[PDB]
Amino acid sequence: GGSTSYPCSFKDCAERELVAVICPYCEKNFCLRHRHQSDHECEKL
């Protein structure tokens, strides 16, 4: 159809990359924008 990728799960997500970064505590795949401790607001910041 068009392109092939697997971005992170979020409503404010507007970035698509090959491999998403893995949080230290959340250990989840996310973009650089959300990767920010302030953006994600990880409880175990």
Question: Which residues define the annotated binding site?
Answer: 8, 13, 23, 26, 31, 34, 40, 42
The CB-of-37 to Zn ion minimum distance in angstroms stands at 7
Binding-site residues for Zn(2+) sit at 8, 13, 23, 26, 31, 34, 40, 42
Is residue 18 a contact partner of residue 31, using CB atoms and an 8 Å limit? no
Q: Which amino acid is at 32?
A: L
DSSP states along the chain: --------S-TT-----SS-EE-SSS--EE-HHHHSHHHH--TT-
> What residues from 1 to 45 belong to the interface with Zn ion (CB under 5 A)?
8, 13, 23, 26, 31, 40, 42
Site of interaction with Zn ion (CB under 5 A): 8, 13, 23, 26, 31, 40, 42
